[PDB]
Every structure is written in structure tokens, then in C-alpha cells.
Design a protein around this ligand. Structure first.
Ligand SMILES: *[C@@H]1O[C@H](CO)[C@@H](O[C@@H]2O[C@H](CO)[C@@H](O[C@H]3O[C@H](CO[C@H]4O[C@H](CO)[C@@H](O)[C@H](O)[C@@H]4O)[C@@H](O)[C@H](O[C@H]4O[C@H](CO)[C@@H](O)[C@H](O)[C@@H]4O)[C@@H]3O)[C@H](O)[C@H]2NC(C)=O)[C@H](O)[C@H]1NC(C)=O
Ligand SMILES: *[C@@H]1O[C@H](CO)[C@@H](O[C@@H]2O[C@H](CO)[C@@H](O[C@H]3O[C@H](CO[C@H]4O[C@H](CO)[C@@H](O)[C@H](O)[C@@H]4O)[C@@H](O)[C@H](O[C@H]4O[C@H](CO)[C@@H](O)[C@H](O)[C@@H]4O)[C@@H]3O)[C@H](O)[C@H]2NC(C)=O)[C@H](O)[C@H]1NC(C)=O
Ligand SMILES: *[C@@H]1O[C@H](CO)[C@@H](O[C@@H]2O[C@H](CO)[C@@H](O[C@H]3O[C@H](CO[C@H]4O[C@H](CO)[C@@H](O)[C@H](O)[C@@H]4O)[C@@H](O)[C@H](O[C@H]4O[C@H](CO)[C@@H](O)[C@H](O)[C@@H]4O)[C@@H]3O)[C@H](O)[C@H]2NC(C)=O)[C@H](O)[C@H]1NC(C)=O
Ligand SMILES: *[C@@H]1O[C@H](CO)[C@@H](O[C@@H]2O[C@H](CO)[C@@H](O)[C@H](O)[C@H]2NC(C)=O)[C@H](O)[C@H]1NC(C)=O
Ligand SMILES: *[C@@H]1O[C@H](CO)[C@@H](O[C@@H]2O[C@H](CO)[C@@H](O)[C@H](O)[C@H]2NC(C)=O)[C@H](O)[C@H]1NC(C)=O
Ligand SMILES: *[C@@H]1O[C@H](CO)[C@@H](O[C@@H]2O[C@H](CO)[C@@H](O)[C@H](O)[C@H]2NC(C)=O)[C@H](O)[C@H]1NC(C)=O
Ligand SMILES: *[C@H]1O[C@H](CO)[C@@H](O)[C@H](O)[C@H]1NC(C)=O
Ligand SMILES: *[C@H]1O[C@H](CO)[C@@H](O)[C@H](O)[C@H]1NC(C)=O
Ligand SMILES: *[C@H]1O[C@H](CO)[C@@H](O)[C@H](O)[C@H]1NC(C)=O
Lengths: 165, 321, 165, 165, 321, 321
């Protein structure tokens, strides 16, 4: 549905809500890889510019207006090439960066989805509603890939049986 | 019990554009366009500019009586003139291949004025030549690097003069001719009605005959002066022969030339600053790959671009919940 | 497997087949966002071109062929820069656009997949075969995110038990 | 977790491990489409370059240094345009190519995931651990999209019941 | 019961290329390359071109007897000549700094012919000079903006003439010299065997001596005419002094010059159209960012590209089921 | 039992860069930058270069006594000189519009030396003129395509000579003038103290007066020679008139000119090779779109780029398990 003010310690992460309370935890692994990926993008865009000494000046007289005009077509030529390519390069890389974040979020979602399976239901908002009770330790266990699903499988099944009747 | 997956938000109002979406508010962003300048003329890679306030290159080289004379720098990376300068040629004229001269002087590794023919060495010609469009402090005066020769007694013997460049540096030499308004002025000034200047080098082979004609008064003057130059190589000699109308060198310039820049037009003042990139509206801190300050830049500059904004999304969409 | 002639009212959508009949329904939400995304792409490509007045003409004489040649290197220079960049820009954005559609289709598929769960099976062709009976209202309910899964869970389970025996 | 030395016959594929042994099998369909996609990318990058005859030479004398300087700004101008655009074009297409492979791998993974369902569990490493016994024929059947899930559904269920108790 | 997810198809055969895939049939597409033109020469941003049919700029300016004389437009945005024009210099010659002249006249904000020295003001020289390569209707004739002076009685007194540009507009002035074939022609035409033209302005200081030599007959003529020009500034005067061989101004041109374009070569005809971008093969509707019409464009044009096709996929793959 | 999904690996250490990641090891890759050359000067699209070893274009055209004389190729695609060549003008001088001449001769479709005025046709002038900076085998000698005329008996009658280009090919003609050091040399060599050269074509109308002045000795010589040229069109005639100081054509050149290239500076040797793209450091196999060999290329070349590396990932990440 959106972003999260409360996740102040990372880019991507988790919000949990249980009987013991609620709060945000960041995935520092995928965050730091994003923060390095995007820093390379910017640095590449900047550092690939090769610049040498130039002195652009108007030094043709009034019997050399054909050469002044040649120099003008040139300058405008380069202005246009640079203006368009820099404008489009920003647009294209921005779409790429924003998709990169969406991709990272979706991957963090999948790591959870495979862990929970039928022990929780997908709400379609990036959340999972557990069938069983998930304490603070259970939540930590889902974040760090340690969730062990047999411990709750029996408890969770009866609870979908309860829903289907 | 729920666990959600999501992403960071903050109070940022920084907006970015994508190919497909305009004005996406984003958590962090980085402009790659340089838009700020310091409002000052600066040294360029450590070397001061030659700043001619209201002086042309021509009037500065000829030693114009108006122009300041402590305008001697050993070296400069670019030249700055005002957009419209006021001290050009006091006597109406022109300089031959002037634009090539300006361009050659735009960046100089070493420059040093030396006296090549003393004013006092003219024993049988008058050196005192002067005009009322070239005052210095109140007395009609002239250019200080160049001497107007005129007849002495009532005669102008053929001048035959040579200068061997003994320095190991190349020499920029200047001279001119005076184009009088009529034959009466011609003989009044030079005696000989029919007259030539010949100038010779290992490279130069010049012959000038003055053009004596009726002309528009410019600053009250109907005569003209035309200036010429060359680079006299290290062990080469320059030879002058004339029986009139010759405006002779007094001083010339040792010159070392290793590269070029240009002439900037700027109203600005010299700050005490150093830059890799100077603009006529100020200097620029040349880290970004693109700028929108001014097209006429000197140095190692970012690429000039017609844009207000080049902002790269770095963080995430800022659509808070 | 392909596209659909019959979906004339939108870009992405659904085809359903039940006992009451069969037909196509478009997702107008994701369609209109696509139709705006692609319109921005085209408009950006066109509107970022800065063009100023130029008069390209051949006005050097036969003792100025070095300058004519300079002017020629320039013109060919710009022709090549523009030709290559425009050709590659089309190629790159086309791959991006076609992937954008694939991404939108896949998202519409996921919205359905999370809703159905074990009440239907994935056929691997972008379709779901229900275990239970899905009437015209049931189909509408799957399209507009309203499908309620308990009502059919019991009926659907016995029907996979029937298949497993 | 990484790539596979042992998959010498294709780009993407499968490794299986059962009681009869273990080994690699390539998906030749998606591999050949990748090998054609990437060959088009390279060929487009190369073949879109239009090149004509040019003679770049320094033929201005020492009273034509303003024109020599114009010719220099031009040459450096083009050098910079080409240097930056070629450098960035490589960077951008490389990210695209590497994502293309990731996309192809993920699709091959999904084809398997929909086939197995609850008859296997996802390990989160691109593998599936079967609940039932999957012989060499069963493995082939999963590779070529032929896996028939009813035959093992009953056997597989009791085996998750065994785990939940 | 089944529900499927999928996408739109239609009857479209529009194909697009991707980096990785060639000839992908697609539902909708948009070419960003402009390929069509209207086959006509048009006004450019609202201003008509100066269309010289079979006339050079030189012959048009000199008032060539062949060329049409209702070729007076107050203003023009570009000039069009034919690829090879037939009415250039009737008498063999050349124009000095011709290419700079053409370029300067390529776009003019205001242009107006004015009489500067009446033909009838030459009291002691013949103004009736004429040649058989410059017929007008059957009688040997000449350029109408310029007068061939020759001796009267058997004499050619020194001409001393000035014209002060009283207009606030700058003035384009033309004159020439006649280079005879030999001394006999020289004195037959001008009496004085040894001869000069002097021309003076606040800027110009010219001296022409005719070159009398044996030469190739061109249109039966062994003599040559050479034309020259300047821009006489608003309150400046031009001064002419000659004792022979002088081809004098009769009419000059008030000129206002605010920018440039060029000379287009086109066989085409003027349509009654308006464009932002003109090509020598037709005008172009400058909305797309790229075109493949012709390289020699004038106006605010799309970028010229060596392509048949630049097609952006907009809709979906069209692979129907 | 397990089934895994995954991708290929191999022993490759080829690294690629992405926008976001540096030094990604990859299974297969393709450099799009051409970095290798063959170290030889080659035919360009099948046509041999004109290779002047230690000869200038000027000395080659004038028939310099040092330079080799089997330097006659019917046709060439570009010219190669050494970086600093040793056989330029034996007698100090210069060539007028030299750079335009070099450029015009840089690519020639047909070239053929023909005798235009035999040395033996000068009945009343000496043709034997020679200098000690132009030896050939030990005797003071001269350029072979051009003749130094001097007085015979004690006289120099006006020369009046024409040559009608009967060939259907255009003709490159060369001539010069001698600028003596003083009037004594002038009359010693030519008798007539006051002297001119006149040269006439349908296009050319030239008048040269020698400049007699004191000058720097260059190779012991204080006199100068200045050379000039034109293209004499197919049925056009060239006319020469002079009473001294004329350095006359003996041979001229049939020339067909369909396009241009340039003058390459290279120390290299001709290999027996064919290329579409030549560089001064070697030829290049012009398949890739970019190269980093050298900027001064001739032919249909890849784009010059300031890079070590342009490597396109083709295969997969190589992170083995
Ligand atoms: C500006 O002044 C300079 C002098 O300060 C001029 O340069 C000198 O000119 C002389 C005379 O023209 C030339 O040199 C003579 O000596 C050389 C040998 O030079 C070599 O040895 C020198 C002496 O030790 C070194 O100093 C040099 O670097 C070099 O190693 C002789 O070979 C010449 O001999 C020939 O000419 C004579 C004179 O007629 C003949 O009679 C002989 O038979 C012989 O064939 C020279 O005599 C040299 O140009 C130079 N010398 C020095 C020391 O610099 C310079 O020319 C002047 N510029 C102008 C334009 O006038
Ligand atoms: C083409 O014709 C034009 C005239 O129609 C010429 O321009 C005029 O020339 C005169 C004489 O050369 C110059 O002006 C004289 O008056 C000025 C004052 O000008 C100022 O006031 C004017 C009069 O009211 C205004 O009209 C002007 O716009 C301006 O405001 C005096 O200062 C001068 O005085 C000096 O020179 C005299 C003459 O010897 C000395 O004796 C004095 O002692 C003093 O030092 C001028 O006399 C001016 O150039 C101009 N005047 C006008 C009204 O336009 C034009 O020159 C001509 N072009 C050529 C090339 O000949
Ligand atoms: C280098 O030599 C060439 C000759 O070998 C010169 O070219 C010739 O010059 C002659 C005389 O100048 C000109 O031609 C005369 O004949 C034409 C007809 O030419 C046409 O028919 C020719 C004859 O059959 C063909 O050969 C041509 O290709 C073409 O089809 C007449 O019309 C002319 O007549 C006019 O001039 C005479 C002479 O005074 C008048 O009396 C007449 O009344 C009439 O008005 C010419 O006489 C032509 O230039 C050319 N001829 C040929 C055959 O080539 C060339 O000029 C020379 N170059 C220089 C610069 O001198
Ligand atoms: C969002 O898109 C709009 C287009 O509607 C952009 O509009 C320009 O905004 C600039 C920046 O201040 C104004 O100077 C221009 O006048 C606007 N153009 C037009 C045609 O209205 C707007 O800039 C975008 N905003 C941002 C912050 O990126
Ligand atoms: C599909 O790819 C082919 C390459 O096999 C393209 O071939 C060119 O098609 C044009 C357009 O009509 C022809 O003029 C050229 O001769 C073809 N080139 C070659 C080398 O054969 C083809 O254009 C592509 N088709 C489309 C419609 O984009
Ligand atoms: C990986 O990135 C590094 C940056 O740390 C690149 O560094 C350059 O490597 C080149 C190639 O041999 C050296 O010549 C340069 O000196 C390095 N630059 C700097 C600033 O150290 C490195 O090239 C990359 N490696 C590859 C193989 O692509
Ligand atoms: C966000 O921006 C505002 C504006 O400057 C700033 O004052 C505020 O403190 C910022 N908030 C945080 C948490 O940094
Ligand atoms: C599709 O294209 C054809 C060709 O013009 C057209 O006649 C036909 O009617 C179109 N079909 C539809 C449904 O618009
Ligand atoms: C991989 O590279 C090395 C280095 O040349 C080569 O010798 C080795 O045989 C290669 N391995 C294979 C399987 O091709």
C-alpha cells in the first residue's frame, strides 16, 4: 500500500503485529546491497564523463561569419546531443532504479511466503495473517529465515478447519 | 498475528521523473547538473588570467597611453576583456591578422617586454611623433612600444635596420605604416613623396606602400595606421628598410607558447580563487558531468546542457501509509 | 499461450469459462496505468528534443575545401551520433515496454493466485481450474478481489480427496 | 547459491538427487532462446553503427590556429560523446543481460513449483525436497512438464502428517 | 470451471524491433521518424524566401539585364537559387568575398534599393558604357545598378565623389574595376594609360590598380570586371577617387541584418505554405525528433538520421490464440 | 529426493561491469572495442597510398633533385609523409595556398606528368639556371619540372607564352617568381631592373612584382622563390607574360579529382595489405563499432574512443557452487 516512516534503520524490511505488540525491523543485508548498487549507478554516470581542456570563445571577425556559423552549428549540435542524452539517461535510469527497489521488496516477500506456506494466509497487501500464534521469537525466526513450520502445522490446520466449518 | 513486507519512507519532497511517470516523490535523490557559480574570475589550474579592464589586446600590446602599464604578468592561462572596451586604437586603424594575434596571446607560458630599438638611436630622423587622440597626461602623446618616425631637417634618409634575436625565446615584433590623407601631408611628414616599407625575416618577405587617399574623419583623423606582426624565431633576424611612413618597433616581446585558450568577455572582477573551469559569469566546481551556467567556458569543464534539472532517483518512492 | 482478440475493452484482463458460459473481461485499472505509462514514454522521447534554428548549407568555395571538409566531418559526425543513438534508443525502450506488459500481466495473475490457493489448481497456461463450481458471480468476485475462500474450501477439499483416490 | 560446472550442455537447467543417483540436465528450449536473444543484443550494438569514409588530418597552418582549434573542439567533442555513450551503453546493457538470465532461471523454477505444489517443499535455495519418492522417470517427468501429481498426493500427505506429529 | 489471465490482441501487423528480438508483431506502434514532405518551398516562420529563379546573387545585386526586376521583397528568411543558375556575370568576372556576401544576404530583416549616384550626374564622363554579353531587349546593354564610366571628349578627369549615408540604416554598396586586355583598349576606353581606384570609408581603405594582361576569351571577352562591396554604416561616408577603369555605383541598398540562414539549392516552386523547417526537396512538419528527408535543412528542424524506420512499441505483442 | 533449478558455470575469468556492480565474473563476453592494428601502411579500399619518404608534396611536385623520381603512381587514396620531412624547398621559399594544394592532391583518381613547355624551346633566354642548395649528383642543379629563366646575351626580352589544355583532363600548373636580394642581383640575373609576371586563365588574372629587399640568409640564400598554381580546365588556355624573375613551367600534371582524403604522418612502411581503415600506427580491421588506436584515421572507421575496454556480458554470472 505504500512506504513506512517507522522503518528508520533500513530500506527494506518488516512490520509485525502480534499480542506482545508491533514494530518495524529492517533487512540490513538487502538494504546495504541496494545502497551500494545505487551508489555505483550515480558514480558511473558521473565518472564515465571524460572532460579535457577547452576554451570556447567567439574569435571570428565580420568577414568570417561562415566560419562563425560553422562553429555555431557545432556548439548547438553538441548542446543538443548532450541535452537529449542526459535528459533521457536520467529518465531511463530512474525507471530502472525504482523497479530495482520493487524487485528487492518482492524477493524479501518471497523468502517469507515459502517459509509460512499454509501456516499463514496472504492478504494481498504484502502481509501474512498467521493461523497460529506468532510471538516475538517466532517473528524474529521468520525474519532471519529460521522459522520452523512443523511446530505450528498441526495448530494451524485445525484453525483453517474451524474456518471452513 | 501478522507480518508484513515493505520499504522505507521519510519526510522528503524531492521529486524525480521516469520514462513512464512524472513527478514521483522519492526518499533520496542526486542532481547531476551543476547550476551554481562563484561570481568571480579565478586562476585557471593555478595560473592567473591576464585581465585587461578597458583595454584591447591591440592597445595593450602597442603600449596605449590611456591603458595601465602595470599590466605585466609573466604568464597567463586566459585573457579577459570587457564586452565593449574603450581603449583600442587611439589613432584610427587596424591590426593585420588581429584575431590570430589575440588567439595566440590567449595563453602564454612566458612573456617579457624587451627594448629592441631604443628611441634614442634615431640620429637622423625625428622620433618625437605624436597625435591629439593619444594623450597620456595632457601633452599630445603616442603608444610607448612603437615610434612614429618623421623627417629631420627637411629629409628622410632610407632607414636600414636589423635586429638579430639573440634570446633563445621567440620574439613577437610589431610595426606599422601610416596612410596619409594626401600628398601634402605625405611630404610634410616624410619629405619623400613616393615611399615603401620592406620587412624581411627567414619567413617574412613584406612590402608595404602607403595608400594615400581622401577618407572619413574618425576621431577627427583622416589618416590611418596599420599594424603588422610576426614571431621572430630564436636565431633569426628581422630587417627593416623604409623611406617613409614607417612606424617602428621600440619594444618587442619574448614569448613562450605551449598551448591555447581564448579571450573571455566578462564584466566580473578577479577573486582570489582557483578553478578547473571558468565561465564569464563565474567559476564552476567541475565535479558533475553536466552544467547549465554559460556556454563560453574555459578549462576542463562539464558538458553544457539546456536543462533546469537532472535528478537521479537514489532512494525509494515516498508514498507513506 | 498468446493474446486475445475477444478482449476488446482493455489491455489486460480475464477470460472465464463456467457452466453458464464464457467470455472476456478487462482490468481497466492496470490497463489505464499502462496506457498512461506508454504515452509518457513516447512523449518523453519526442519532447526532450531541443531544436533551434539552423541553416545547413554548403557555402565554401574551391579554395576553401579544407573548411568544407571540416564542415563535412561535422555533419557526418552528428549524423552518426544521431543515427546510432536513435536506433539503439528505440531497441532498448521496446524491450522495456514489452517487459512492462509482461510484468503487468503477471501481477494480475498473482492477485488471482493468492485468492484461490488450493480451491483451484494452476494449469501452467495462465489459467486456474477450480475444484468447486464458480458461477458468474463467483467469477466477478475473483476479478474484483472479493472472492471469499471459506465458502468453497470444504467443497474443494473433498474434491482433491476424490482425485487422490 | 551459485552456478553449476556440471551443466555443460545448456545455460539453464536442473540438478536432481534421488536414490538412483544425481546429475544435471539442461533446459535446451529456454537456453537456445537466451543464446539468440544475447546474440541479437551484440549484433544490434555492432550493426547499428553507421560509418562512412573520413580522412581526419591536421592540415591548417600557423596563421589558421583558430580553425585548427575549431577542428580540435569538434574532434574532442565527438570523442567525449562516443566515449561516454559507449561506456554507459555497455554498463546498462550488462545489467539488462544479467537480469534477463535471472528472469529465465526464475521462470524455470515456477514451472516446477506449480507442478509439485504440496507434494514437495521449497528449500529456499532453488531446490524442492519431495515428500514422496521421485525416481529417474519421475524426475524426467518434472523436467518435461509431465509430472502427474495425483499419483503421489496420498503418499505425500501422510508424510507431512508424519512430520506435524 | 476456469479463469484465465491474459492480454489484448487485434488484427495489427505493425512490427517493432527490440534489442534481443527482431520483427515482433505488436498491437500498436508509433514511428518517431518523419519521412514525409510537401514538395514545395514555403515561408519559414511566416517570412517568404527570396527566390531567384535562374539568377545568381551577384547578377541580382548588380541589376543583371536578363534577370527579372520585380525581384524586390522587403524581407526574406532564406534565399533559393537553382542548382546551376544561368544568369551570373554577363561580362566575365568575379565578385570579391562573394561567399561572405551571399551568406550576409541569406536572411535580411529589411532591404530597400536607393539611388546613390544618379546616372545623369556624370557631366564630364560618359555613362553610356555597354557590352554585347549584356543585352536587355536587343540593344547592347549593362547592369542597371552600376555604371561603366568611359572618357568624354578624349579625356578622363580624376573623379572625386563622396556619399554620406544619411539613412539610419546601414548601406550595402557595390563597385568594381575593369581589367582591360591591353594598353590600347586601356587608353581607348579611359585615355589615361596609368590608372587607379581609391575607396575610403571609416573602415575601408582600398587601392585598386587594374591588371592589364593577355587573357582567355570568355564569352568572347578577354577583359575582366571585378566587383567589391562594403557595408557603409549609418553616419559614415564612402569616398571614391579614380582616373579610370572604375565601375561606379548608381544604386545601393539599405540593409537591416538581425540573423543568418543560408542559400538553398532547389528546383522546386513556391507553394503558399508556412513551415518551421524547409528542405530543398520540400517542407517538413517538425513535430518528430528525427527525420530522413535531406541533410540541408533550414529552420528549427528535427535531427537528420540515416534510417528508414524508428518505431516505438506502444501496445502488446500480437500473438493471437 | 530433490530437484533444483539453476544455471551454467565454467572456468571463465572474463569480467564485466554493470551500472550497479563492478567486476562481475561472467561465463562468456564480447569486447566491442577494437584495440589491435597490423603495424603497416596499407592500400585503402584497394588503392595504394602515395608514399613520400623524406619528401614534401611541394618538392615532389616541383621535381626536387634529392627526392626519388620513380614516385609516379597513376592513382592514390591518401598521401603519407614522414612527421618531419627533409626534402622540402631546396631554395628557400614558399608555396602559395600550399595547404589547399596538399589537400587537393591527397586523393587522386588519375595523375600523369606531361611536358607543357620544353626546356629547349627558350631560344632567347637562358634555361640553365641552377643553385648550390639544389645539387642532383654533384653539379649545382635545380627542380626538374620548372625552369629558372635568366638573361641571354645581356638581355631579357618580354616572354609571351600560352598553353591550351587540349587534353580532356584538367591540368595542374605550377610556376613561381624569384625575389632577389638587391637591384644588382636583379639586373645581373634578368637585366631589366623593373619587372613583372602576368598569368591569365579564364579564371586567373594574376600580376606578380618581385620584392627586392635585404633578407635573412636561409641555407646561405638571401633571395626567395615563391610558387603558385592553378587548375587549368579542359579547353582553357594559360597565358604567361614576363620580363624577369619568372620561374617557368616545364611539366604540368593531368589530374582527375573525384574525392578527398588527407596527408598522413607516419614513420611506418608499406605492407602488402588492404584495409577499409588506416591509422598512422597501423591498419585496423573495421568490424567493431569502436576503437582506441589513434584519432587520425582514414577510411570507413570505427568511432575513436578513450577506453581500454568495452565488454558486453553475453553469458551468465560465474559464481560456482
Ligand atoms: C644571428 O646571429 C647568429 C650569430 O651569433 C647567427 O648564427 C651564426 O651564423 C654563422 C654565420 O652565418 C653560421 O655559422 C658558421 O659556422 C658554422 C659552424 O657552426 C657550427 O659550429 C659553430 C661554431 O663553433 C657552432 O657555434 C654552431 O652551433 C654549429 O655547431 C660553419 O659550418 C659555417 O661555415 C660555412 O660558411 C662560411 C661563411 O661563408 C664559409 O666560408 C665556410 O666555407 C662554410 O661553408 C658558418 O661560417 C651559423 O649560422 C651561426 N653560428 C653560430 C655560432 O651561431 C645567425 O645566423 C644570425 N641570424 C641571421 C638570420 O643572420
Ligand atoms: C555625415 O554627415 C553628418 C552630418 O549630417 C556628419 O556628422 C556630424 O559631423 C559633425 C562635424 O564633423 C560633428 O559634430 C560637431 O558638433 C559636435 C556636437 O555634436 C553633438 O551635438 C550635435 C550638435 O547639436 C548633435 O547633433 C550630436 O548628436 C551630438 O549630440 C561638436 O562637439 C564637434 O565639435 C568639435 O569639432 C569642431 C569642428 O572642427 C571644432 O572646431 C570644435 O572646437 C569641437 O572640438 C563637431 O563640430 C558630428 O560628427 C556630427 N554632427 C551631427 C549633428 O550629426 C558625419 O560626420 C558625416 N560623416 C562623415 C564620415 O563625414
Ligand atoms: C583551346 O583551343 C580550342 C580549339 O581547339 C578552342 O575552342 C574553340 O574555339 C573556337 C574559336 O574560339 C570556338 O568555336 C567556333 O565555332 C563555334 C561552333 O562551335 C560549335 O561547333 C563547333 C564547330 O563544329 C564544335 O566543334 C563545337 O563543339 C560546337 O559544337 C561558333 O559558333 C563560333 O562562332 C562565333 O565566333 C566567330 C569567331 O569570331 C564569329 O566570327 C562568328 O560569327 C560566331 O559568332 C566559333 O567560331 C569554340 O570556342 C571552340 N571550337 C572547338 C571546335 O573546340 C578554345 O577556345 C581554346 N581555348 C582558349 C581559352 O583559347
Ligand atoms: C511535473 O510535471 C510538470 C508538467 O505538467 C512539469 O512542469 C514544469 O515545471 C517547471 C518547474 O518548476 C515549470 O518551470 C514549467 O513551467 C512546467 N512546464 C509546464 C509545461 O508547465 C513539472 O516541472 C514537473 N515537476 C517536477 C518538480 O519535476
Ligand atoms: C526483420 O529483420 C530483417 C532481417 O532479416 C530486416 O531486413 C530488412 O528489411 C528491410 C525493410 O523492408 C529491407 O529493405 C532490407 O533489405 C532488409 N535487410 C536485409 C539485410 O535483408 C527486416 O526489415 C525486419 N523487418 C521489419 C519489418 O522490421
Ligand atoms: C574493477 O574495478 C576497479 C576499481 O577499483 C578497476 O580499477 C582499474 O583497473 C584498471 C585495469 O587494469 C587499472 O588500470 C586501473 O588503474 C584501475 N583504476 C583504479 C582507479 O584503480 C578495475 O579495472 C575493475 N576491473 C575490471 C577487470 O574490470
Ligand atoms: C525532514 O525535513 C525537515 C525540513 O528541513 C526537517 O526540519 C526535519 O527535521 C526532517 N526530519 C527528520 C526526521 O530528519
Ligand atoms: C483491422 O485492419 C483492417 C485493415 O484496414 C480493417 O479494415 C479492419 O476493419 C480492422 N479491424 C477492426 C476491428 O478495426
Ligand atoms: C578453461 O580455460 C583453460 C585456460 O586456457 C583451459 O586450458 C581449460 O582447458 C579450459 N577448460 C575447458 C573445460 O575448456
Amino acid at each position: 500500500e505504500g512506504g513506512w516512516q517507522g522503518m528508520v534503520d533500513g530500506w527494506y524490511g518488516y512490520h509485525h503485529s502480534n499480542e506482545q505488540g508491533s514494530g518495524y525491523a529492517a533487512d540490513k543485508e538487502s538494504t546495504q546491497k541496494a545502497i551500494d548498487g545505487v551508489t555505483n549507478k550515480v558514480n558511473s554516470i558521473i565518472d564515465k564523463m571524460n572532460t579535457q581542456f577547452e576554451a570556447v570563445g567567439r574569435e571570428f571577425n565580420n568577414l568570417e561569419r561562415r566560419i562563425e556559423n560553422l562553429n555555431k552549428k557545432m556548439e548547438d549540435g553538441f548542446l543538443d546531443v548532450w541535452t537529449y542524452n542526459a535528459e533521457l539517461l536520467v529518465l531511463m535510469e530512474n525507471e530502472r532504479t525504482l523497479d530495482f527497489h520493487d524487485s528487492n521488496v518482492k524477493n524479501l516477500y518471497d523468502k517469507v511466503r515459502l517459509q509460512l506456506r499454509d501456516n499463514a494466509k496472504e492478504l494481498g497487501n504484502g502481509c501474512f495473517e498467521f493461523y497460529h500464534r506468532c510471538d516475538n521469537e517466532c517473528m524474529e525466526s521468520v525474519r532471519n529465515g529460521t522459522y520452523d513450520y512443523p511446530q505450528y502445522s498441526e495448530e494451524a490446520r485445525l484453525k483453517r478447519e474451524e474456518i471452513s466449518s | 498475528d501478522q507480518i508484513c513486507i515493505g520499504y522505507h519512507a521519510n519526510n522528503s519532497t524531492e521529486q524525480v521523473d521516469t520514462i513512464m511517470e512524472k513527478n514521483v516523490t522519492v526518499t533520496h535523490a542526486q542532481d547531476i547538473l551543476e547550476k551554481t557559480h562563484n561570481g568571480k574570475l579565478c586562476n585557471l589550474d593555478g595560473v592567473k588570467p591576464l585581465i585587461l579592464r578597458d583595454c584591447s589586446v591591440a592597445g595593450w600590446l602597442l603600449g596605449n597611453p590611456m591603458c595601465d602599464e602595470f599590466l605585466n604578468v609573466p604568464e597567463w592561462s586566459y585573457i579577459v576583456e570587457k564586452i565593449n572596451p574603450a581603449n583600442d586604437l587611439c589613432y584610427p586603424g587596424n591590426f593585420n591578422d588581429y584575431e590570430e594575434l589575440k588567439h595566440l596571446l590567449s595563453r602564454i607560458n612566458h612573456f617579457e617586454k624587451i627594448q629592441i630599438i631604443p628611441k634614442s638611436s634615431w640620429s637622423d630622423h625625428e622620433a618625437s611623433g605624436v597625435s591629439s587622440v593619444c594623450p597620456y597626461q595632457g601633452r599630445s602623446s603616442f603608444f610607448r612600444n612603437v615610434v612614429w618616425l618623421t623627417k629631420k631637417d627637411n629629409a628622410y634618409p632610407t632607414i636600414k635596420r636589423s635586429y638579430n634575436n639573440t634570446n633563445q625565446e621567440d620574439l613577437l615584433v610589431l610595426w606599422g605604416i601610416h596612410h596619409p590623407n594626401d600628398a601634402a601631408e605625405q611630404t610634410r611628414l616624410y619629405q619623400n613623396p613616393t615611399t615603401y616599407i620592406s620587412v624581411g625575416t627567414s619567413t617574412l618577405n613584406q612590402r608595404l606602400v602607403p595608400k594615400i587617399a581622401t577618407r572619413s574623419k574618425v576621431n577627427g583623423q583622416s589618416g590611418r595606421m596599420e599594424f603588422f606582426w610576426t614571431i621572430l624565431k630564436s636565431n633569426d633576424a628581422i630587417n627593416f628598410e623604409s623611406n617613409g611612413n614607417f612606424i617602428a618597433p621600440e619594444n618587442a616581446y619574448k614569448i613562450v607558447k605551449k598551448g591555447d585558450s581564448t579571450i573571455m568577455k566578462s564584466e566580473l572582477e578577479y577573486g582570489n580563487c582557483n578553478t578547473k573551469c571558468q565561465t564569464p559569469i563565474g567559476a564552476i566546481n567541475s565535479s558533475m558531468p553536466f552544467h547549465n551556467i554559460h556556454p563560453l567556458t574555459i578549462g576542463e569543464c562539464p558538458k553544457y546542457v539546456k536543462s533546469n534539472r537532472l535528478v537521479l532517483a537514489t532512494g525509494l518512492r515516498n508514498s507513506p501509509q
